[PDB]
Design a protein around this ligand. Sequence first.
Ligand SMILES: CC(C)(COP(=O)(O)OP(=O)(O)OC[C@H]1O[C@@H](n2cnc3c(N)ncnc32)[C@H](O)[C@@H]1OP(=O)(O)O)[C@@H](O)C(=O)NCCC(=O)NCCS
Ligand SMILES: CC(C)(COP(=O)(O)OP(=O)(O)OC[C@H]1O[C@@H](n2cnc3c(N)ncnc32)[C@H](O)[C@@H]1OP(=O)(O)O)[C@@H](O)C(=O)NCCC(=O)NCCS
Ligand SMILES: CC(C)(COP(=O)(O)OP(=O)(O)OC[C@H]1O[C@@H](n2cnc3c(N)ncnc32)[C@H](O)[C@@H]1OP(=O)(O)O)[C@@H](O)C(=O)NCCC(=O)NCCS
Ligand SMILES: CC(=O)N[C@H]1[C@@H](OP(=O)(O)OP(=O)(O)OC[C@H]2O[C@@H](n3ccc(=O)[nH]c3=O)[C@H](O)[C@@H]2O)O[C@H](C(=O)O)[C@@H](O)[C@@H]1N
Ligand SMILES: CC(=O)N[C@H]1[C@@H](OP(=O)(O)OP(=O)(O)OC[C@H]2O[C@@H](n3ccc(=O)[nH]c3=O)[C@H](O)[C@@H]2O)O[C@H](C(=O)O)[C@@H](O)[C@@H]1N
Ligand SMILES: CC(=O)N[C@H]1[C@@H](OP(=O)(O)OP(=O)(O)OC[C@H]2O[C@@H](n3ccc(=O)[nH]c3=O)[C@H](O)[C@@H]2O)O[C@H](C(=O)O)[C@@H](O)[C@@H]1N
Ligand code: NA
Lengths: 191, 192, 189
Amino acid sequence: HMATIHPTAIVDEGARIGAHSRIWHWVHICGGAEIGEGCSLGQNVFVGNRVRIGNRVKIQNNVSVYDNVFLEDDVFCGPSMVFTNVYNPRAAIERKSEYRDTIVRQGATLGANCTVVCGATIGRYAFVGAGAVVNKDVPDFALVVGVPARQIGWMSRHGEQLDLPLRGNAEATCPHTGERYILTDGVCRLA
Amino acid sequence: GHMATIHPTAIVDEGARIGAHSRIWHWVHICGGAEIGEGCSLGQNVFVGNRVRIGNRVKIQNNVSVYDNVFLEDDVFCGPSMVFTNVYNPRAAIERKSEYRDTIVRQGATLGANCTVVCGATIGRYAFVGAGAVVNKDVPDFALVVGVPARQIGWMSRHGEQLDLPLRGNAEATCPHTGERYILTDGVCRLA
Amino acid sequence: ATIHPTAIVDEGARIGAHSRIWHWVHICGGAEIGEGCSLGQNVFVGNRVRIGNRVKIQNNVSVYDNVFLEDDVFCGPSMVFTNVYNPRAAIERKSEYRDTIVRQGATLGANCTVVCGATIGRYAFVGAGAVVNKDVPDFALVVGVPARQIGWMSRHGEQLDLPLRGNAEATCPHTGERYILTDGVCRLA
Ligand SMILES: CC(C)(COP(=O)(O)OP(=O)(O)OC[C@H]1O[C@@H](n2cnc3c(N)ncnc32)[C@H](O)[C@@H]1OP(=O)(O)O)[C@@H](O)C(=O)NCCC(=O)NCCS
Ligand SMILES: CC(C)(COP(=O)(O)OP(=O)(O)OC[C@H]1O[C@@H](n2cnc3c(N)ncnc32)[C@H](O)[C@@H]1OP(=O)(O)O)[C@@H](O)C(=O)NCCC(=O)NCCS
Ligand SMILES: CC(C)(COP(=O)(O)OP(=O)(O)OC[C@H]1O[C@@H](n2cnc3c(N)ncnc32)[C@H](O)[C@@H]1OP(=O)(O)O)[C@@H](O)C(=O)NCCC(=O)NCCS
Ligand SMILES: CC(=O)N[C@H]1[C@@H](OP(=O)(O)OP(=O)(O)OC[C@H]2O[C@@H](n3ccc(=O)[nH]c3=O)[C@H](O)[C@@H]2O)O[C@H](C(=O)O)[C@@H](O)[C@@H]1N
Ligand SMILES: CC(=O)N[C@H]1[C@@H](OP(=O)(O)OP(=O)(O)OC[C@H]2O[C@@H](n3ccc(=O)[nH]c3=O)[C@H](O)[C@@H]2O)O[C@H](C(=O)O)[C@@H](O)[C@@H]1N
Ligand SMILES: CC(=O)N[C@H]1[C@@H](OP(=O)(O)OP(=O)(O)OC[C@H]2O[C@@H](n3ccc(=O)[nH]c3=O)[C@H](O)[C@@H]2O)O[C@H](C(=O)O)[C@@H](O)[C@@H]1N
Ligand code: NA
């Protein structure tokens, strides 16, 4: 049941990778990293030391999970999406002491080639469209697109838009499962 | 010296079909189901899935992952770190391997550096997707599209320069490099 | 320079003291890299490339032929350079490369893209994800697709209290250094 690791991958002494996880070609994981069970890390992923990745997190090719990135259970990182840890980098000024956290909450989907400016929290089951640039917190269930990203709707856990306004108070059901969502002052939650 | 073939660091899985005179560079991984034509170039860290067909003289720059259900015709150009997809609405907790949508890129299309194509879109012959655009709808033959999301702003000749053609209606234009004539018919561009 | 054993640095490449080359980097034999640089995972460097001193290049950056990086340039993770403006696979355009010159202290944010031909000014700052397709003035802060200027960044890397255009003066509070905006061009006084 131990994690399976491609022979071309480099997992540095000390790293913790949970059962049933799968680590693919030319992945490098630093020794501080903690990765849960049933994760998948695609070709050329990088993982830093100051990183916690939960269970069943699927990370596509070419994603660098840097120090100060935290991924909850069931997060999806699409191909070539990009995390950061310094807000205002300058090569002349080492900013390793100024890292900002990026927290991605359970079930959030980070679309292909999106970018997340450090300091943002991405809420539970949020959905960041392909290519978006996130530079503010993303509410639970929010669908955001564009550069920079702006909220255009709400996404059910299953991954389809809810017939719910952005603002105010309202209720709606998932078009697939029928489960109910409540909007209260512009914040969406599961009933 | 000798012509480069397949860099020794590449991994080409048993079964892959690669045409003559193609060049596969450092730390490329090609899956066993893939078919790749003649005269192609695959840059550093390319990935190619199993359910993939790539034509002839397809030039793929570094860091492009040609996933299952992407199909590239002859003379397609994939710019550095452009991005294909195959699931429209991914959720880690919901496996969607039976829900892949095709991305078909027709002959001569150019996909600019760091663009992204949302699966399901078809990219027309000799289309031109500007650097960093995000394509989420079909792109007509010859269309020049830019932006997030991508919008059509012009028409690009086979040579790769804008044609003096309006976006809609009927019109004609000539490429000054080749003298090739183009006809627009109710907003659809073709070579004469 | 210190070079990870998985990196491939082709014979002829010049790499200065105190530089660090990380996992599965490939550097071509014509490249010139200065002192105190850092090249992250899977970086690629072409032959017709000059990279100055103390240039920090994060993972997944391809520094292609005709890209020139001055000292103290920062290239963020997965940012993207180009060298052909209008590529077509059928038409080899290796003779038509356009230069991309990135001047001293400029920062290229994560996952930005620079269309070849642009010059990026000294201490400019290209926001994460921007697509640059025009020259970026010294100290300009630009964001968006395509990139548009929204302010001015000090060397330290925080916005200066200057109008977007016009004539004005400002001081960096971290260093006390003075900036002068003359006819929309910012400089150190
Ligand atoms: C967000 C997404 C799921 C579409 O959701 P949807 O509910 O079907 O939304 P629609 O297509 O109706 O689009 C709604 C609006 O948002 C815009 N939009 C949708 N996705 C967008 C994106 N990624 N970037 C910018 N705008 C986008 C649409 O253009 C439309 O606006 P318009 O009418 O002004 O043109 C899809 O576009 C997307 O980004 N998928 C991600 C695919 C991916 O990253 N997969 C990775 C795994 S392989
Ligand atoms: C599209 C491209 C070829 C320019 O074509 P062009 O016919 O010269 O067009 P122009 O530069 O006149 O631009 C026309 C409009 O489109 C905009 N535009 C052009 N390219 C754009 C891009 N990639 N993204 C967003 N907008 C863009 C321009 O800003 C201009 O708009 P504006 O007048 O409102 O500012 C070029 O910008 C590009 O994207 N090249 C791709 C380079 C590449 O990917 N190379 C990879 C191989 S190394
Ligand atoms: C540019 C940046 C430094 C913010 O600078 P700032 O002076 O704090 O600017 P603000 O956040 O006040 O933003 C000012 C405006 O520009 C917009 N903006 C800021 N950064 C943006 C970006 N990258 N793309 C698009 N828009 C952006 C903001 O949304 C705001 O406009 P709005 O009011 O319409 O929303 C930051 O967003 C950024 O891009 N950092 C780069 C991180 C990176 O690449 N790190 C790499 C090393 S790990
Ligand atoms: C990766 C990281 O967090 N980078 C931040 C950092 O940059 P940098 O150029 O100094 O790099 P870097 O820490 O040396 O690592 C470079 C590469 O070496 C590899 N690397 C490095 C160390 C290690 O122990 N293992 C390893 O694999 C691994 O491949 C790694 O990617 O400081 C910058 C800053 O000051 O603003 C921040 O903006 C950056 N986000
Ligand atoms: C690659 C791919 O098509 N991913 C889709 C997929 O995700 P995932 O995390 O389950 O991955 P994955 O199939 O295990 O392959 C991961 C990596 O392992 C390597 N890989 C994998 C298998 C193989 O035979 N060879 C190989 O190299 C190779 O490097 C590969 O990149 O299911 C998602 C979903 O359900 O929504 C879809 O959104 C994703 N687009
Ligand atoms: C990389 C580069 O500058 N590409 C430009 C080029 O495309 P292309 O497909 O012909 O490639 P390429 O020169 O064969 O190199 C491909 C890969 O082989 C590797 N490579 C290649 C040669 C070499 O000596 N060493 C090496 O590592 C290395 O990994 C390299 O990335 O001609 C196009 C064009 O005509 O418009 C331009 O738009 C492209 N910007
Ligand atoms: Na990218």
